[PDB]
Design an enzyme around this catalytic site. Structure first.
Site, mmCIF file in Angstrom:
data_model
loop_
_atom_site.group_PDB
_atom_site.id
_atom_site.type_symbol
_atom_site.label_atom_id
_atom_site.label_comp_id
_atom_site.label_asym_id
_atom_site.label_seq_id
_atom_site.Cartn_x
_atom_site.Cartn_y
_atom_site.Cartn_z
ATOM 1 C CB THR A 8 0.411 -2.151 5.831
ATOM 2 O OG1 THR A 8 1.247 -1.467 4.873
ATOM 3 C CG2 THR A 8 -0.934 -1.421 6.004
ATOM 4 C CE1 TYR A 32 -6.266 -18.108 9.816
ATOM 5 C CE2 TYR A 32 -6.731 -17.571 7.517
ATOM 6 C CZ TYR A 32 -6.656 -17.199 8.849
ATOM 7 O OH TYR A 32 -6.963 -15.898 9.208
ATOM 8 C CG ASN A 82 7.120 1.293 2.275
ATOM 9 O OD1 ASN A 82 7.802 2.334 2.224
ATOM 10 N ND2 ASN A 82 6.365 0.975 3.339
ATOM 11 C CB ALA A 83 7.296 -1.119 -4.301
ATOM 12 C CG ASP A 120 3.846 -10.318 0.277
ATOM 13 O OD1 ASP A 120 3.878 -10.920 -0.816
ATOM 14 O OD2 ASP A 120 4.213 -9.142 0.389
ATOM 15 C CG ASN A 179 -2.065 -1.077 1.167
ATOM 16 O OD1 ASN A 179 -2.213 -1.885 2.235
ATOM 17 N ND2 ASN A 179 -2.819 -1.141 0.171
#
Lengths: 247, 247
Positions: free
Chosen positions: B132, B100, B11-12, B109, B9
């Site tokens: 984030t 899960y 950083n890259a 990720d 959102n």
């Protein structure tokens, strides 16, 4: 009787003290839309159901972080109670020794809580107040307000995530998204409180009693031993002390 | 060489792998204003200063949580590299056993990190990713992804407060407002990580290695022993593994 009002960004808590004891308290959402007459009518109803009249109230103290509603609350006090309330602000006397470098930037209710905590529980103390922010104040063994620690509040942190009931999940490792977030807020917050409080005690000369207040203090104290006493009415009791000192 | 891109959102992070090793990485703010040609020109410059050309890159994989920029990044890959990139999404193969209940709601990720963590560090594992949000994943001793814990990220929680450098204050008990907030964010976060990780280990059959990643992992690990290994490039390494499996 003395009427106290603690008004927050989100919530307000009212109380009436009779012979220095808290007779009744009431909680509500802070309402920026409400007028002085609608406050007076709501207060009338709360008093009536408690067996009281406006007449019963002889003094009023208000602590507030919402200037846009002070004018209306003051006008309601003047109109319905025929009393100009004491307002917790610069120049109210507290008896508190502040050694913090920023005394004027200390939240009014941190001061109120410290006055109540020291009187009711002694010193040194760690006071944890779970409100809009969660604050940790440290009062030393000479009853000096030294400063403390500020973190995001339980709800504000939970909102920034869920974007709400702070529930205990069936496991720490959430088997599903909702469960993972429940774990995070709850156990993250407990870990936050445990960690900060242990570090503050480490810096302390004498070992302090830890007292906590705020709506969600009970949830945290159920999950940890780090809090000695949860006192849900510390701020109300403090405002009562302040009224008495300043009357 | 294989080019990987992890777009957040905020950083890259880009990297180029040569003979299965990370040769170079680059970090940047995600820019919703940038066009495919301005991405191509920035990438050209990063490659040139590394001694590389577009031609050096034979494959590309992208992981992204920002749909509004995928079209441009894909078009940049097609135009400058003459390659259609692999996109981490539903239907990419990972080799990961997810137990899960919500496999489809697991962040891309988290999956990437788990694939890398298991391959590089074994099982059972706790993987902490400070982005984030701060996530804690638990992989059991059979290498199954069980779920975990989600909390507000260091910066998002620090912003909701300060409303920024995550600095160590001279004392836990802040002698001044800025100092109190610094303490709160830092030591609160450490306490949060310590508390959650200890509870997750308590639920675990075998005692897991704890690995952490994300820009601020180092700050936390400097303050606690709870993290065994900080691996700043776990996600890049994972995306490289995914590219290889899916090539």
């Amino acid at each position: 009787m003395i009427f106290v009002l603690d008004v927050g960004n989100t919530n307000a808590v009212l109380g009436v003290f009779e012979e220095g004891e808290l007779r009744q308290h009431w909680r509500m959402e802070t309402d920026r839309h409400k007028t002085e007459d609608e406050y007076g009518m709501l207060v009338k109803q709360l008093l009536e159901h408690e067996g009281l009249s406006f007449e019963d109230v002889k003094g009023i103290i208000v602590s507030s972080v919402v200037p846009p509603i002070m004018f209306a609350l003051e006008r309601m006090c003047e109109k319905y109670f025929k009393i100009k309330p004491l307002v917790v602000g610069p120049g109210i006397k507290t008896g508190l020794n502040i050694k913090y470098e920023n005394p004027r930037e200390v939240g009014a209710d941190r001061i109120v809580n410290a006055v109540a905590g020291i009187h009711l529980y002694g010193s040194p103390l760690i006071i944890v107040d779970f409100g809009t922010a969660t604050t940790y104040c440290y009062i030393n063994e000479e009853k000096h307000y030294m400063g403390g620690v500020i973190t995001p509040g339980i709800m504000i942190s939970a909102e920034a995530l869920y974007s709400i009931e702070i529930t205990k999940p069936s496991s720490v490792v959430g088997k599903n998204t909702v469960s993972a977030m429940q774990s995070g807020i709850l156990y993250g917050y407990v870990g936050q409180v445990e960690g900060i409080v242990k570090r503050m005690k480490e810096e302390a000369k004498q070992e302090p009693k830890v007292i906590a207040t705020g709506g969600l203090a009970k949830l945290i104290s159920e999950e940890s031993n780090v809090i000695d006493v949860v006192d849900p009415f510390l701020t109300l009791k403090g405002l009562y002390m302040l009224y008495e000192r300043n009357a």
